[PDB]
Design a protein around this nucleic acid. Structure first.
Length: 79
RNA sequence: GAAACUUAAAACCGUGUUGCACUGCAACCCGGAAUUCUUGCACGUCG
């Protein structure tokens, strides 16, 4: 979570706390699509069925906003 | 007046550092995007 690459004609800013929910919602939506798919190989002949378990988020560097880490753990609760 | 060289001999020479102090130095990601994937019954034949 940082400024990123702002571009030559823009005013740089940090992503709001509403935008971090929409990033984590697309991660767990893309991890539920992988449980129907097969992660490399033959796949259509029965290979590579995969499963996720115990997905949880932390804060490794720096503090968060407050009551935000627990609602990022709820987007990951449905895989 | 006609007749007898202010001539002869003598180095503008001897000694002496264009020498002493001084960083081609400070700042800079060989970095950003990309599924070793697509098709395939361990099966057929019996005086």
């Amino acid at each position: 979570v940082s400024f990123g690459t702002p571009g030559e004609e823009q005013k740089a800013s940090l992503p709001s706390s509403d935008e971090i929910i929409e990033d984590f919602n697309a991660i767990a939506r893309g991890l539920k699509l992988l449980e129907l798919d097969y992660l490399g190989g033959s796949g259509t002949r029965g290979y590579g069925q995969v499963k996720f378990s115990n997905l949880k988020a932390r804060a490794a560097v720096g503090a968060l906003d407050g009551s935000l880490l627990e609602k990022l753990n709820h987007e990951l609760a449905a895989v």
